[PDB]
Amino acid sequence: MGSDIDEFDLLEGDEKTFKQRRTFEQRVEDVRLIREQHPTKIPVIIERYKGEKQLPVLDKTKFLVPDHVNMSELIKIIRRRLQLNANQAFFLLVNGHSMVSVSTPISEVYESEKDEDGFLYMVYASQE
């Protein structure tokens, strides 16, 4: 049944991510330097989800966030910089998932979710 149907994979010939722009050792050294001059700030990479067509792009991917800022405030900041409408869905995903704990300091989040290179990576999307 339906055995007469064959499948084909569709190829497409279509601003690289931070990990692609910088080597692992370069990123580690960046984090070391940041740790040295801004010991109360957290280095965060924030990028648009690759497949996201609804939300716009930030022209900046690399951020320093004060330790005390929680995810709620950061979501608000990012939504603000994106100039989103109040009713537009937005998700800030860390290690591929949204944060259950939206009230804790980003330094606390950092200690759990940081990459091996020392950056905390986030991706934003209109789903999850």
UniProtKB/Swiss-Prot annotation:
Q: Where in the cell is it found?
A: Cytoplasmic vesicle, Autophagosome membrane; Endomembrane system; Mitochondrion membrane; Cytoplasm, Cytoskeleton
What changing R79A does, per the record, is: Impairs cleavage by ATG4B
Arranged from A to Z, the UniProt key words for this protein are: Autophagy, Cytoplasm, Cytoplasmic vesicle, Cytoskeleton, Lipoprotein, Membrane, Microtubule, Mitochondrion, Phosphoprotein, Ubl conjugation, Ubl conjugation pathway
| One GO process term, biological-process aspect | macroautophagy
Q: Say if the entry is tagged with keyword Phosphoprotein.
A: yes
Effect after changing F63A: Decreases C18 ceramide binding
- GO function terms (MF aspect): ceramide binding; microtubule binding; phosphatidylethanolamine binding; ubiquitin protein ligase binding
The record's annotation in InterPro entries points to: Atg8-like, Ubiquitin-like_domsf
Q: Which domain of life is it from?
A: Eukaryota
The consequence of Q127P is:
Abolished delipidation by ATG4 family proteins
The membrane topology of this protein is: Lipid-anchor
Documented effect of changing H38A: Decreased interaction with Legionella effector RavZ
Q: What the entry says about post-translational processing?
A: The precursor molecule is cleaved by ATG4 (ATG4A, ATG4B, ATG4C or ATG4D) to expose the glycine at the C-terminus and form the cytosolic form, LC3-I. The processed form is then activated by APG7L/ATG7, transferred to ATG3 and conjugated to phosphatidylethanolamine (PE) phospholipid to form the membrane-bound form, LC3-II. During non-canonical autophagy, the processed form is conjugated to phosphatidylserine (PS) phospholipid. ATG4 proteins also mediate the delipidation of PE-conjugated forms.
What Pfam family is a match, any one? Answer: ATG8
Tissue distribution is:
Most abundant in heart, brain, skeletal muscle and testis. Little expression observed in liver.
Cellular component, GO annotation: autophagosome; autophagosome membrane; axoneme; cytoplasmic vesicle; cytosol; endomembrane system; microtubule; mitochondrial membrane
The annotated subunit structure for this chain is:
3 different light chains, LC1 (a cleavage product of MAP1B), LC2 (a cleavage product of MAP1A) and LC3 (produced by one of the MAP1LC3 genes), can associate with the MAP1A or MAP1B heavy chains. Interacts at microtubules with CABP1 (via EF-hands 1 and 2) but not with calmodulin. Interacts with FYCO1 (via C-terminus). Interacts with TP53INP1 and TP53INP2. Interacts with TBC1D25. Directly interacts with SQSTM1; this interaction leads to MAP1LC3B recruitment to inclusion bodies containing polyubiquitinated protein aggregates and to inclusion body degradation by autophagy. (Microbial infection) Interacts with Hantaan hantavirus glycoprotein N; this interaction contributes to the virus-induced degradation of mitochondria by autophagy, which leads to degradation of host MAVS and inhibition of type I interferon (IFN) responses.
Its function, per the record, reads: Ubiquitin-like modifier involved in formation of autophagosomal vacuoles (autophagosomes). Plays a role in mitophagy which contributes to regulate mitochondrial quantity and quality by eliminating the mitochondria to a basal level to fulfill cellular energy requirements and preventing excess ROS production.
What family does the database annotate?
Answer: Belongs to the ATG8 family.
Its name, as the record gives it, is Microtubule-associated protein 1 light chain 3 beta
Q: What would be the name of the gene that encodes this protein? A: MAP1LC3B
